[PDB]
Structure formats: structure tokens, C-alpha cells
Short mmCIF file of C-alpha atoms and ligand atoms in Angstrom, two decimals:
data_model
loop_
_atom_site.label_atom_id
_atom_site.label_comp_id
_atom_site.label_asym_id
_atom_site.label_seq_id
_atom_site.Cartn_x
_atom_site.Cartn_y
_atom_site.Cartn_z
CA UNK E 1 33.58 44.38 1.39
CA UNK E 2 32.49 40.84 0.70
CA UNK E 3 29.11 41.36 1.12
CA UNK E 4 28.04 37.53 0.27
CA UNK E 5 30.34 36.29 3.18
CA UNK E 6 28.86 39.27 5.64
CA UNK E 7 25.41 37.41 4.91
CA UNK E 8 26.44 33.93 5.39
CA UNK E 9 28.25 34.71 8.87
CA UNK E 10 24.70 36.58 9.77
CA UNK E 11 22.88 33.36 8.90
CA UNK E 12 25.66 31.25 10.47
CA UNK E 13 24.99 33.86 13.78
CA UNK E 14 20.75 33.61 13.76
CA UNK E 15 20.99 29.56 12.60
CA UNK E 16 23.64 27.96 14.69
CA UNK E 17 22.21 24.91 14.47
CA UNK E 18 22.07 22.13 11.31
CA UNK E 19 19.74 18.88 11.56
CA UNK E 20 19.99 16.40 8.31
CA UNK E 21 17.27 13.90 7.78
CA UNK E 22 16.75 11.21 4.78
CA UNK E 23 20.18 11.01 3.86
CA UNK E 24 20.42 14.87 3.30
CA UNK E 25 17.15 15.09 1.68
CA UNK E 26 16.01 17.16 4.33
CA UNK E 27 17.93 19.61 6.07
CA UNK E 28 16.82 22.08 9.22
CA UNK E 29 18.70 25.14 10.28
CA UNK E 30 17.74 26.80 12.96
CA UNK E 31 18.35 28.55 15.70
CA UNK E 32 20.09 28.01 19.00
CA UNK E 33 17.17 28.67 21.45
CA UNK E 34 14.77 25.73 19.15
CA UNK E 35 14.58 22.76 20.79
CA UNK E 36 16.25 19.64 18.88
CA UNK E 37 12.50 17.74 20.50
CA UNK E 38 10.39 20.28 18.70
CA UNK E 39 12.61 19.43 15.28
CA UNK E 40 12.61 15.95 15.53
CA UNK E 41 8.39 16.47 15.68
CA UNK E 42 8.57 18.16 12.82
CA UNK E 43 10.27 15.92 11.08
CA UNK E 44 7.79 12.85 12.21
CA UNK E 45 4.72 15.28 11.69
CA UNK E 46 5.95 15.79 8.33
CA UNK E 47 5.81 12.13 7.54
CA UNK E 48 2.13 11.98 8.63
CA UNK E 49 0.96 15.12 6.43
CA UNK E 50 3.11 13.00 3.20
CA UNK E 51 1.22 9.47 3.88
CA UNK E 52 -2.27 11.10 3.65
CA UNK E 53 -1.88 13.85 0.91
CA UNK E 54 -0.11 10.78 -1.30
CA UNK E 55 -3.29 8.63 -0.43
CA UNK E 56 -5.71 11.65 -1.51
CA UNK E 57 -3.49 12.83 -4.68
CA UNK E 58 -2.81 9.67 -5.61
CA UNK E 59 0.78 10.50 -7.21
CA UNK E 60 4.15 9.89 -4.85
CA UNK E 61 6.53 10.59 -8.08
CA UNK E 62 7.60 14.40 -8.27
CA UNK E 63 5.95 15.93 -11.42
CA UNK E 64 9.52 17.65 -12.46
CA UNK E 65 12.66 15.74 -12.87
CA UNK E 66 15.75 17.69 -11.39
CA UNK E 67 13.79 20.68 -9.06
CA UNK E 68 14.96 22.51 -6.12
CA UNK E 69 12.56 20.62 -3.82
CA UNK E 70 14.29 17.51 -4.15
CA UNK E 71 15.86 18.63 -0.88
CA UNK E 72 14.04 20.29 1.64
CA UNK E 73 15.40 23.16 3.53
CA UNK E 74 13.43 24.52 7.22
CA UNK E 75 14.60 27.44 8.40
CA UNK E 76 13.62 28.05 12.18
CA UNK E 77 14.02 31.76 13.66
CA UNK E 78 14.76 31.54 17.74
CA UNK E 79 11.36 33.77 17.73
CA UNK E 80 9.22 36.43 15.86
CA UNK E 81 11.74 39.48 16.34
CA UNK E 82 14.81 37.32 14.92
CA UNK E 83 12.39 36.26 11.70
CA UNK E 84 12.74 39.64 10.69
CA UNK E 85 15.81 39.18 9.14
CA UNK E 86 15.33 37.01 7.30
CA UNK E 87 13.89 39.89 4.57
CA UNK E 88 17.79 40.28 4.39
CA UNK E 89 19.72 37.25 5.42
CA UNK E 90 17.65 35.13 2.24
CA UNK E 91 15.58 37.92 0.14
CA UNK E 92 11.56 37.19 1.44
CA UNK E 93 8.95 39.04 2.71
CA UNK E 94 8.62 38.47 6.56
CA UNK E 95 5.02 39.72 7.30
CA UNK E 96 3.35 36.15 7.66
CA UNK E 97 3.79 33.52 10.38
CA UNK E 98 6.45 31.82 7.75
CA UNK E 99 6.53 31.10 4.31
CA UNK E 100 7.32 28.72 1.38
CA UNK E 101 9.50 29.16 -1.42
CA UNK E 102 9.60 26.61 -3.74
CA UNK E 103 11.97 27.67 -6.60
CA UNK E 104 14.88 26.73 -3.83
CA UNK E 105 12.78 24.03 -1.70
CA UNK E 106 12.79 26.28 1.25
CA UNK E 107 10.17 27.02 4.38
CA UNK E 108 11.03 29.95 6.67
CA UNK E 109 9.34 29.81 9.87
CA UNK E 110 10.19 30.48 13.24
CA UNK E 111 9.46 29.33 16.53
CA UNK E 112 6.68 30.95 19.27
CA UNK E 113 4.85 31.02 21.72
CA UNK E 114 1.00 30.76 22.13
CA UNK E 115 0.82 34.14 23.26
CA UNK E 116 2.58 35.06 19.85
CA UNK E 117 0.85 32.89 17.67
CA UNK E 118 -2.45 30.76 17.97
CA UNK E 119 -0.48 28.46 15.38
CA UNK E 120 2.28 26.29 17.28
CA UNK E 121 5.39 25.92 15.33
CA UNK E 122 4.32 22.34 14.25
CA UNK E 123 0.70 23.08 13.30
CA UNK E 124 1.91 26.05 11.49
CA UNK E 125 5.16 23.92 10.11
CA UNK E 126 2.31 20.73 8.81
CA UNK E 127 0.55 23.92 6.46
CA UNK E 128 3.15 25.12 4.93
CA UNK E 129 4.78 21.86 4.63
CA UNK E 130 1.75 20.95 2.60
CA UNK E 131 2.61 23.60 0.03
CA UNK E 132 5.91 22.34 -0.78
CA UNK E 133 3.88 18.96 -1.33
CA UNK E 134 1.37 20.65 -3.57
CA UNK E 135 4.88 22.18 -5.31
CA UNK E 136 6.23 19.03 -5.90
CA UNK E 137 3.60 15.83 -6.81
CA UNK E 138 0.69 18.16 -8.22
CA UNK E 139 1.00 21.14 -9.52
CA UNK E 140 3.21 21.28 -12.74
CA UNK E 141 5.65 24.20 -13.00
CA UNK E 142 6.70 26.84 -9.70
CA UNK E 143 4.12 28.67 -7.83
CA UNK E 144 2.76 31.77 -9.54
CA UNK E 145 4.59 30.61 -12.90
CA UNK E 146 3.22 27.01 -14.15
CA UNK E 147 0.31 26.77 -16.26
CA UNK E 148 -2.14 27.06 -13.37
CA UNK E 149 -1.11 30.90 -12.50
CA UNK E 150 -1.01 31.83 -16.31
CA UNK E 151 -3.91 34.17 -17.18
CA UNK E 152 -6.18 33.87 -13.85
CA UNK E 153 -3.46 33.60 -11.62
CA UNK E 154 -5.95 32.97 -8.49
CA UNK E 155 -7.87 30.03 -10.75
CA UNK E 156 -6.46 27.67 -7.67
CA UNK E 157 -6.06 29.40 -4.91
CA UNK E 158 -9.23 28.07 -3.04
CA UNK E 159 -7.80 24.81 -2.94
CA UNK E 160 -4.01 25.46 -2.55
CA UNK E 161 -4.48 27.19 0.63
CA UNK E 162 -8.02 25.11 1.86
CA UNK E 163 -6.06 22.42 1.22
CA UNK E 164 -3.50 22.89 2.75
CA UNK E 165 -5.18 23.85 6.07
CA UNK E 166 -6.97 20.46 5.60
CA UNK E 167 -3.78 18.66 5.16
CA UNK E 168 -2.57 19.79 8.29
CA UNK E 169 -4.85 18.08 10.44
CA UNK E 170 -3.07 14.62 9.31
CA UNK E 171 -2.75 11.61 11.15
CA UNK E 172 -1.36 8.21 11.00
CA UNK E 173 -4.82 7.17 10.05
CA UNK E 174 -6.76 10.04 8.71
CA UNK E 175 -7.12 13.84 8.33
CA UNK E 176 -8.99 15.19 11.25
CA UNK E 177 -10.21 18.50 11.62
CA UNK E 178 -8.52 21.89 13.68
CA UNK E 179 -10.22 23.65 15.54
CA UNK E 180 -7.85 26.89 14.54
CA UNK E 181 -10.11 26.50 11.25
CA UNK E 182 -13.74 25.22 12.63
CA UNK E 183 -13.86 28.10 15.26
CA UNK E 184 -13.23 30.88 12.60
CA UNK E 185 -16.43 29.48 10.43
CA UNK E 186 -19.63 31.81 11.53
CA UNK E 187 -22.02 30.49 14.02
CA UNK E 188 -24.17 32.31 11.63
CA UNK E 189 -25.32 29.87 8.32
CA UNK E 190 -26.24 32.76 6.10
CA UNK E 191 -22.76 34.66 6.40
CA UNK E 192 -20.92 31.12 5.49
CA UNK E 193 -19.37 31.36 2.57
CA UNK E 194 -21.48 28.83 -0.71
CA UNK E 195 -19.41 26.78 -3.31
CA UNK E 196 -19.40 29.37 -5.95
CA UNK E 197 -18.17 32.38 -3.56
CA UNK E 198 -15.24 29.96 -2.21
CA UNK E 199 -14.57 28.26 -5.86
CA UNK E 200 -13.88 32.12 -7.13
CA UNK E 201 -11.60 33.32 -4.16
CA UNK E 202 -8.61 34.92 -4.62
CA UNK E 203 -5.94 36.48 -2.23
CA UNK E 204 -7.54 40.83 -3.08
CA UNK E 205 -10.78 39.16 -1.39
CA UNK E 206 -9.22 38.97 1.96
CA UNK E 207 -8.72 36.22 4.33
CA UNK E 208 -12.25 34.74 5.02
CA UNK E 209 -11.17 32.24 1.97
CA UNK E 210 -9.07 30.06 3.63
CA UNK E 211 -11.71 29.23 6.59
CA UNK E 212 -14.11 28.31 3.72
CA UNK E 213 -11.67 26.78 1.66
CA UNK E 214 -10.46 24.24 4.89
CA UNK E 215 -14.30 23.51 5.39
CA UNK E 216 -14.76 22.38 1.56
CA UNK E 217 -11.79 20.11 1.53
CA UNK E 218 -12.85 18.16 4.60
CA UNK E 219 -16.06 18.32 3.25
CA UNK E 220 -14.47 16.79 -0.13
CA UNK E 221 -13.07 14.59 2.03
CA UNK E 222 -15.48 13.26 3.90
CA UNK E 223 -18.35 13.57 1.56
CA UNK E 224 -17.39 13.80 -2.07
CA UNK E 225 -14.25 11.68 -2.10
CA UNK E 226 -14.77 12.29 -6.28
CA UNK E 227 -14.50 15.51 -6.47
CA UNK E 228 -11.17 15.62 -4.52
CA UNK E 229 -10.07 13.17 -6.63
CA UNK E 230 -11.54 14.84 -9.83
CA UNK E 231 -9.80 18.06 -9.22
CA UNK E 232 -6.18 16.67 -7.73
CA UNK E 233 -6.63 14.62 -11.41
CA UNK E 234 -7.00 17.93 -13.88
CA UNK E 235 -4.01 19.39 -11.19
CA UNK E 236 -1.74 16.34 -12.33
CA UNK E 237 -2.11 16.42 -15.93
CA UNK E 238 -1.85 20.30 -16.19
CA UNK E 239 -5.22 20.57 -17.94
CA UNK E 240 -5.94 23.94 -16.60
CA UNK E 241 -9.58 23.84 -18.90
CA UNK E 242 -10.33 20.56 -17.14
CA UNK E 243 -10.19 22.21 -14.18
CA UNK E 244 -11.91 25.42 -14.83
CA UNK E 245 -15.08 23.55 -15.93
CA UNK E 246 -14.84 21.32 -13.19
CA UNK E 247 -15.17 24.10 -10.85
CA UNK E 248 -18.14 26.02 -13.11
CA UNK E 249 -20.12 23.08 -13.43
CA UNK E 250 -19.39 22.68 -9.27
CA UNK E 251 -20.46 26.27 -8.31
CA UNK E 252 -23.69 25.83 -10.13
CA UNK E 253 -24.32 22.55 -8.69
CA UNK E 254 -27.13 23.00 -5.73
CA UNK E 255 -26.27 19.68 -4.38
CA UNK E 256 -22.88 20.38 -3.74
CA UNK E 257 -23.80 23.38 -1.85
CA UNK E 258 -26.51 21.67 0.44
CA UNK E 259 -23.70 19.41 1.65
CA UNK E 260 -21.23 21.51 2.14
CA UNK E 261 -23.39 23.95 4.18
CA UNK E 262 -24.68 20.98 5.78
CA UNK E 263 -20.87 19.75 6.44
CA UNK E 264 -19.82 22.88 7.69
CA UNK E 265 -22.96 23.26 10.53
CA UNK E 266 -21.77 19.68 11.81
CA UNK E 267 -17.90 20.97 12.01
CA UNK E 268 -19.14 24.19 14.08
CA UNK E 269 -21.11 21.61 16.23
CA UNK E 270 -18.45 19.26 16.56
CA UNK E 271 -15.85 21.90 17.33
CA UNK E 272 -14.57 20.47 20.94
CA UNK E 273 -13.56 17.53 19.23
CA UNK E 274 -11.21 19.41 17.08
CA UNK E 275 -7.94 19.44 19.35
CA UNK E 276 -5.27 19.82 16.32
CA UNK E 277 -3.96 16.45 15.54
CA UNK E 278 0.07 16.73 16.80
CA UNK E 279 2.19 13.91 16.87
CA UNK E 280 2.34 11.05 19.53
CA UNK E 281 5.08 11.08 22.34
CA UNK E 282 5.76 7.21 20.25
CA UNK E 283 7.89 8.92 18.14
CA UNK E 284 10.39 9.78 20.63
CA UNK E 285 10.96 6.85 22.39
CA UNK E 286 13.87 4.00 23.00
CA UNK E 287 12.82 0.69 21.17
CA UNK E 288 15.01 -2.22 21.15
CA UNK E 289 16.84 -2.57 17.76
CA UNK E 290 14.45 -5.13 15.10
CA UNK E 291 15.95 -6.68 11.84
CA UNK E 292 15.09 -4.73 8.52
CA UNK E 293 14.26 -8.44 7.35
CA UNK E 294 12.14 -9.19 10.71
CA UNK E 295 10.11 -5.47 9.99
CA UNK E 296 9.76 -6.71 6.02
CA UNK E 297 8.32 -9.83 7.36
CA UNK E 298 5.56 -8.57 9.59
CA UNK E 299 4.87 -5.90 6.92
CA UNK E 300 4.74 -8.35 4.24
CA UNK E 301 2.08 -10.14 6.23
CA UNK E 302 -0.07 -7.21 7.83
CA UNK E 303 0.12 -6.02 4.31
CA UNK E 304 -0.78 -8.79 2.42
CA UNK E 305 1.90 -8.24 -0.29
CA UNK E 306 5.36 -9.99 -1.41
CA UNK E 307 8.34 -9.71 -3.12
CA UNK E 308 8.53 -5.92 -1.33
CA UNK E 309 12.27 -3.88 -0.98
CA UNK E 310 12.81 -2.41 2.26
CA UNK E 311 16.01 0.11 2.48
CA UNK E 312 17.46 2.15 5.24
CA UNK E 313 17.88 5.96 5.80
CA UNK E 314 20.25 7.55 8.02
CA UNK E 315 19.10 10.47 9.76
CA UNK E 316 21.23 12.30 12.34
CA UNK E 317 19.41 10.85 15.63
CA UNK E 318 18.09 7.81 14.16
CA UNK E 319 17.77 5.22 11.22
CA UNK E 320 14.56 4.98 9.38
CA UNK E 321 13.46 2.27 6.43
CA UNK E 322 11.49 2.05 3.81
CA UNK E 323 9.82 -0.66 2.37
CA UNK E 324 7.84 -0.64 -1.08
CA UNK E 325 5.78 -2.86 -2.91
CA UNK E 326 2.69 -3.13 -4.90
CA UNK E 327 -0.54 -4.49 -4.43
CA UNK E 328 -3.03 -6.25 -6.84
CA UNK E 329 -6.88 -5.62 -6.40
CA UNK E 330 -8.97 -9.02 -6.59
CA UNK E 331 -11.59 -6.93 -7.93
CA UNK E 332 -11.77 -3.34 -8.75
CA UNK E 333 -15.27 -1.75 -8.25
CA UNK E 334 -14.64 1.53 -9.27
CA UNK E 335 -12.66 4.98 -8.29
CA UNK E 336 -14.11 5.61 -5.20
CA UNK E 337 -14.78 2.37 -4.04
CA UNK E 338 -10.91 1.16 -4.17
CA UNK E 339 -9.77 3.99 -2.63
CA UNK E 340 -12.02 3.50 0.49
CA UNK E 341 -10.74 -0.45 0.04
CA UNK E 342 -6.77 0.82 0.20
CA UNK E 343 -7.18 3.39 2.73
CA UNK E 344 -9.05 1.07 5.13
CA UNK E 345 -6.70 -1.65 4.09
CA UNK E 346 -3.41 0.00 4.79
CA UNK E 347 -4.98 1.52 8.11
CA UNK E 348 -5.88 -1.86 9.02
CA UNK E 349 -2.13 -3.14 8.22
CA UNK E 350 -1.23 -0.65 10.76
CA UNK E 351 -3.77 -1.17 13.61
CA UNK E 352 -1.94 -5.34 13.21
CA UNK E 353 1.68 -4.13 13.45
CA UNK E 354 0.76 -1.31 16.12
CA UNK E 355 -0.66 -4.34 18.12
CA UNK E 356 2.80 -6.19 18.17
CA UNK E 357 5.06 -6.29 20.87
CA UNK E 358 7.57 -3.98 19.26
CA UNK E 359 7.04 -0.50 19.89
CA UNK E 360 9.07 0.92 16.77
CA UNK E 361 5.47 -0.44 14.83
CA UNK E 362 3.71 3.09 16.24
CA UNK E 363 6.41 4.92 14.32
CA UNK E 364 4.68 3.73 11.19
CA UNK E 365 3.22 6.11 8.28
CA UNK E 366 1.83 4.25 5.04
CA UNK E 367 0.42 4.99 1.79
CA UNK E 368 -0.53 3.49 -1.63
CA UNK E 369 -0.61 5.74 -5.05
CA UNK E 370 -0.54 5.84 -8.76
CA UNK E 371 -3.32 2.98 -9.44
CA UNK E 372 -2.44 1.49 -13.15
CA UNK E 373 -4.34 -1.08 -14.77
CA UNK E 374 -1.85 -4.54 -15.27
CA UNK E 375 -2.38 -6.44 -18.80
CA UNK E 376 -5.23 -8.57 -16.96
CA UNK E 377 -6.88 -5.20 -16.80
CA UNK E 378 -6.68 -5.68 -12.55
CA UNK E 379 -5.58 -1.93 -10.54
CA UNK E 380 -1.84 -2.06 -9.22
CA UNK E 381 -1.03 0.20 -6.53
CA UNK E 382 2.29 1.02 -4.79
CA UNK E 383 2.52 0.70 -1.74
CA UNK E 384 5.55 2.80 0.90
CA UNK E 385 5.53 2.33 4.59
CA UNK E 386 7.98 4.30 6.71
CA UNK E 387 8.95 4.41 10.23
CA UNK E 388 12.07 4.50 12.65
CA UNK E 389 14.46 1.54 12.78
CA UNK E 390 16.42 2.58 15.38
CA UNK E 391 17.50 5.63 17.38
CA UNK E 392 21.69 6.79 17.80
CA1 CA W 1 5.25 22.65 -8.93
ZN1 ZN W 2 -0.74 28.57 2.87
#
């Protein structure tokens, strides 16, 4: 009779098994046959994917006070056949490898094997997680209902899923690319996909899109650092005419074109290289126990900034800090120019700390974001590092 409580004992049956991370700010169920190795991954390969798309976007503060996605739920299916259900256990369409819903902060996924899947569950798991950080820091409104999906509702869909794809190649460090992606590109130059044909794409054009829309964000990237940063700007602010002309007066522009045909040929040659970017073995290793004051310390000095907060997180296997600051450029020399400065900055802050004695250091994700000019008219970033204090 009570249908509600027939579902919830289903989901209690297929998802046994709870994990909480961040003090409840991000909860996996899942089910009993997934590893609790594989979820702790996820949860240090999510960390990763954050640092980088907050250096790229250049916003850490959730457009939308109050959302769903202020927790984050990950629901893991034993395997492919048990998925199934969950087109009745929660309400969504199961024909994908997993999916993101982010009107209740929720990714449904499942776990497989690589005969199942050429996506493992965490390279699959660092994609979609992207989307739920596309959801939250830059694009105003939910999916398929902001401003952005009003009128042409596939105006951004090149870059939400390229994007995405890129993002999931994250490192400590970098973004590096997959080789799921770079081996789907055509050997062939002339059936490669140019700017305009990507910039137009939408999901009634097939799947060839997301290849092509991967290769343009690493070349974006790596290449034309401004016109990431132009776009993820019009993406912010919700000016959806920005954006449109942006991407006319970039699908007309010949240059852009010779370099991203020219980027793409050197990511087909450099394919072997291309071994998707999972996370290190450091994560789940026994450290001895360090001081939040020692860790704020040797931050502070790696770092080069003062005055910071650092604050602890309880997770279920382990504690976790955070420590924020800001940081004052001595000199700005333009957009471009200081981001290059901050990213090789903070990665150089982390190369110092990873060279310590203490192995909890390779634990370590960073980022800086929101640059603001001070009254002096000098750029002030924030700064967040984040990494494991000490394991239960
Ligand atoms: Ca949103
Ligand atoms: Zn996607």
C-alpha cells in the first residue's frame, strides 16, 4: 500500500551502503559489491577535478544561494544490470553510463568492468562530476532551465560536455589529456570537425561533438588561455548575448581554426602519452598525525601568504583541513599573464611541501579564484588548499 516506503526499502536493498564526506556535504550510497577503496578514490579524484576547474573558471563561490547541490549525493549501482532500476527506485532515464541531476545534487552511476565499459567508474565518475561543477559556480539557473537553455537550448552544449571531458583529465598539477577522447579524433584531418561545426553542436547532431568539443577545450587550454577565460566570463555573469557573439566572431575567426586543427594533429600524435590521469596510491596511505598549526605553517611559507584560516573536516575514514587565504600580486601584467603567474605559483607551493618529509603533503589539491582589484588598484586572489590530516 505505501508505495513511498516500498521504494525506499528497494533503495535501502540495491544501496546498502552510506559513505559521508565534508561534514555531510557529500554523501555516497552505494552498493554492497563497490569497494569502500574505489569510493574513497572518488572522493580524492573529485578534489583534483575542483582545484583545476576553480583555477580555469576563476569563481569558487556557488552562483545560487540555498540550491540542492550544496550537498552532493553519488549513487553507485553494484553493476550495469542493477542500474536499471534506478528508472524506478529515483525517476531517471538509465540508458547512459550514469547521469547528473542537478535540481537534487545527485550523480547516478554504477560500477563496471572494462569489458562493460571503456570508462572506469572513476574516469567516468571525474565527467560527470564536472557537470555538477558547471551546475553550481558557472552556469546561473538548473540545466535545461537558466537563461543559457532559454530560446537555443543547445547555445552551450559544445562546451558543457567538451568541457567536461577536458576536466576529467585533472591532476594535482594540470589537466592532461585521455586517451578515451584523443583516440576517437580521425586519423583523417579533413573529417575533423572546424571551430564553427563544433561551436554550433547540439545533442540531434549525434555524438561526434563531444570528441571535438574535448579537443577544443584542451586546445583552449593550452593555446588560447583567453578564450577559456572569455567564455567561462559571459557563463558567470549570465550574459547569454556576450556569449553568442563570442562564439560568432570565434567560428569566423581563421586563426582559431589553424590552431585548433593544428592542436588536435599533435593530440592524435601524442596519443600513447594519454594514459587517463587517475589518482595516486598517496591518497590511501598511513601518515603520522601533523598539527593543523604545523600544516598552516609550512603552507604559509611554500605559499608565500599570512594571516591564512585553516579548519578541519570530518569525513568518515579520515580528517581533512582547509586552509584559505589571499594573495596580493606585486605587479599585475594582465589576464593571462597572472593566471600563468598563480597557476605556476601554487604548483610550485606544492612541488616544496610534496618535497617535505611528511607524506600527508602529496594529499594536497590547491587553487586560487575570484581576482578583485584592492583600493591600491593591485589583483587579490583567494587562495584554498586541501588535503588529508589524518586517517581513523
Ligand atoms: Ca546552475
Ligand atoms: Zn556529460
Amino acid at each position: 500500500t505505501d508505495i513511498n516506503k516500498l521504494i525506499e526499502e528497494g533503495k535501502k536493498h540495491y544501496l546498502p551502503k552510506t559513505y559521508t564526506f565534508d561534514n555531510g556535504k557529500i554523501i555516497i550510497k552505494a552498493g554492497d559489491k563497490v569497494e569502500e577503496s574505489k569510493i574513497q578514490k572518488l572522493y580524492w579524484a573529485s578534489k583534483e577535478v575542483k582545484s583545476q576547474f576553480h583555477r580555469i573558471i576563476g569563481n569558487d563561490k556557488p552562483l545560487e544561494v540555498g540550491n540542492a547541490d550544496d550537498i552532493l549525493t553519488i549513487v553507485i549501482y553494484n553493476n550495469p544490470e542493477e542500474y536499471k532500476l534506478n528508472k524506478t527506485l529515483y525517476g531517471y532515464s538509465v540508458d547512459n553510463g550514469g547521469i547528473y541531476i542537478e535540481g537534487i545534487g545527485t550523480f547516478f552511476t554504477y560500477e563496471r568492468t572494462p569489458q562493460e565499459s571503456i570508462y572506469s567508474l572513476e574516469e567516468l565518475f571525474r565527467h560527470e562530476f564536472t557537470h555538477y561543477l558547471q551546475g553550481r559556480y558557472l552556469i546561473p539557473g538548473l540545466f535545461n532551465k537558466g537563461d543559457f537553455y532559454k530560446g537555443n537550448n543547445g547555445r552551450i552544449t559544445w562546451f558543457e560536455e567538451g568541457s567536461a571531458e577536458f576536466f576529467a583529465g585533472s591532476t594535482r598539477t594540470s589537466v592532461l589529456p585521455r586517451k578515451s577522447m584523443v583516440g576517437g579524433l580521425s586519423k583523417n584531418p579533413k573529417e575533423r570537425f572546424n571551430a564553427d561545426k563544433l561551436l554550433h553542436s547540439k545533442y540531434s547532431d549525434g555524438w561526434d561533438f563531444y570528441k571535438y568539443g574535448y579537443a577544443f577545450s584542451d586546445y583552449m587550454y593550452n593555446n588560447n588561455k583567453k578564450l577559456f577565460s572569455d567564455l567561462v566570463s559571459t557563463m558567470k555573469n549570465n550574459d547569454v548575448k556576450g556569449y553568442e557573439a563570442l562564439i560568432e566572431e570565434s567560428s569566423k575567426d581563421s586563426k582559431i581554426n589553424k590552431d585548433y586543427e593544428y592542436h588536435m594533429e599533435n593530440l592524435v600524435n601524442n596519443y600513447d602519452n594519454y594514459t587517463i590521469p587517475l589518482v595516486s596510491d598517496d591518497y590511501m596511505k598511513q601518515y603520522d598525525n601533523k598539527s593543523l598549526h604545523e600544516i598552516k605553517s609550512d603552507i604559509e611559507k611554500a605559499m608565500d601568504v599570512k594571516n591564512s584560516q585553516i579548519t578541519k573536516e570530518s569525513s568518515q575514514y579520515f580528517d581533512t583541513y582547509n586552509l584559505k587565504a589571499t594573495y596580493t600580486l606585486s605587479s599585475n601584467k594582465g589576464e593571462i599573464s597572472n593566471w600563468n603567474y598563480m597557476n605556476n605559483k601554487i604548483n610550485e607551493a606544492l612541488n616544496k611541501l610534496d618535497n617535505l618529509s611528511w607524506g600527508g603533503y602529496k594529499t594536497v589539491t590547491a587553487y586560487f579564484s575570484n581576482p578583485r582589484l584592492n583600493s591600491n588598484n593591485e589583483v587579490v586572489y583567494d587562495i584554498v588548499f586541501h588535503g588529508l590530516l589524518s586517517h581513523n
